[PDB]
Amino acid sequence: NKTQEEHLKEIMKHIVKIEVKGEEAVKKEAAEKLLEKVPSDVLEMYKAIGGKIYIVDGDITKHISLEALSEDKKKIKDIYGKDALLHEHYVYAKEGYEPVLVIQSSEDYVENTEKALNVYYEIGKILSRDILSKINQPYQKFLDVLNTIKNASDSDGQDLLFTNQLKEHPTDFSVEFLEQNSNEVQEVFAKAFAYYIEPQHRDVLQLYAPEAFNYMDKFNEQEINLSLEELKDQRMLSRYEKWEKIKQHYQHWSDSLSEEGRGLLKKLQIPIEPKKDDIIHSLSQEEKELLKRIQIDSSDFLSTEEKEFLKKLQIDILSEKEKEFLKKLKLDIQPYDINQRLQDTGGLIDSPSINLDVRKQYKRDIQNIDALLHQSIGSTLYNKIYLYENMNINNLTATLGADLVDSTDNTKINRGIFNEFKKNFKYSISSNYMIVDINERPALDNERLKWRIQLSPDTRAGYLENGKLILQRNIGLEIKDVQIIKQSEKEYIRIDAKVVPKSKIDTKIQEAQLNINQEWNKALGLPKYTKLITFNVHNRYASNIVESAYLILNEWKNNIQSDLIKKVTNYLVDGNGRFVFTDITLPNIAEQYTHQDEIYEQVHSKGLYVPESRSILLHGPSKGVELRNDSEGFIHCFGHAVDDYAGYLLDKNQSDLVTNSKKFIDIFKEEGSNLTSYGRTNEAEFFAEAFRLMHSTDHAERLKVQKNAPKTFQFINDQIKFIINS
């Protein structure tokens, strides 16, 4: 009973043009009651593309705008597909860069529910051919509804919406189809919109085609506002008008910025690479001669990019001590990247994962930027405000990012990985500073994720001249939708999300942890209140890190002897171990760092077992040396746990690894090169790798150990019984 009707009137005051003879009291009243059925936002979107609605008397073909139609544009087909003659019908929507909608007149749109349907049908046409066509829709989302109907139980749904063209189609409706049969798909969308808008035929649509009815329901009740937003995003004036108010709102804030202010925000956008000059300067003759004799490439804990810089240091100017050296240069040759540091520690800046000096240096800049970004977006110049961000999927899941793009057609996205990635994405967290765009902008080649974030009046941000905002750290995000969209003849994943108090997301993760222990403590016979499993979640693919823990442990349960688990995970719990599932990097989990001697003795990887804490750490985001999933990683690391308990049972006076034994070192002397190249690294890594394959979910991988690692399959099995029975 408020503003809803106000724009209805304004919008209608513009586009709606009544031109009749009979007292335009009833006439003008007809169209009112008729178009009030239509969702308000489709009316403004017609406006948006420059559309006009005309309520005329007589032969509608006898109006200005229409008299310019050829011979064909005169013979249509009603909602039912029955041919007609325009100068006989009562509605028509002309297409073209200057759209128009001509509606005859009658007060019986109340009664003639069949005609009111047609009008709505046509409007529908406007909505899928004229409006949505400009933002590349309907797309995959709607293709899905369409397919759900053809390949489904009752054949009625098809009968009510599809035509033989569609009805007789052999396979499903792929993106390629919708593309060279747009007319077709557009028609279906229209009929669905019609039956849904006309309150009488709605039931027929919900009865014989609920997938369709549900779709149109959710769409005209919310998802349509995001359509309008998209439309607006393509208009130069809209884009500039929006940018301006924002610029205005932050005007005082910016004018007050100092030089240091702009200094900080500036590095926070481009990291300082280490300068070769300083590097060399801090070396020693000892270390610098080693630097030449050193086969930098010969190391395997340095990335090719890092290794690269490391080579250039030779031109410009192994064993134990030797490699110990390369572990320090690794910490030193790292860019000074403030946002990277916040992500790597998930906001835990005091983490002793880097040299004390540089840590302090990072804390100051952060505490400072935290004060610079003190003014919230909340303004009197606007309500909902959507900001945009382009992301690289590898940032959330390198394992999935690995197969997200169709290996052949770079422009297409593999639907398989899509539903997998879409799977448990319910919430996100941001620990570093999110840099977004006021209006959406094309992305880099390696960025197939396009976020559309609804900010909160409470959200603090800084305005940038280039048209971007720098947001505050520790933001809470709820995913509201995830679909495949087309933009610039390439496919992306739109991720509609809404900002919410980080505390809210953290509480979800907190309860989740309580639940996951109240469950496995039981299934293992551990005291009701033990801290076994721990979620250390701080980054953008949060919810997935949580929901994955459950699925990892299930597989670790369904592939290993329950009695081998209990025995081992009891040893662990005894030394206060933990099963840590995290998105921050490993060198930042206490379970590892609180035990290191030197910070340069840190390890980051898919998974990692820590004896001194008896805990298994599993980093979610990455992708371990070819291991199709998180599961396998956990299990391989459990192998280390077992190698721990095993050797322990030997001479308890000193827990040592059973994989150290004189006997085993020999099994490795000949079999160590039969499994995986990675297992070929050493004993403990051969033992866990072998252990892993043995308990694989793919038996194929099991026989592989049996007919290639005999003495091993036997050794590993002995231990198991040894442990079980002890």
Binding site: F301, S303, T304, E305, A398, Q592, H595, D597, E601, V603, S605, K606, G607, L608, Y609, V610, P611, E612, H619, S622, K623, G624, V625, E626, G633, H636, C637, H640, A684, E685, A688
Partner: peptide, 11 residues
């Protein structure tokens, strides 16, 4: 003193 890695695959 040691720990048991499980490296990823960078480039």
């Amino acid at each position: 003193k040691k720990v048991y890695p499980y490296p990823m695959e960078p480039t």
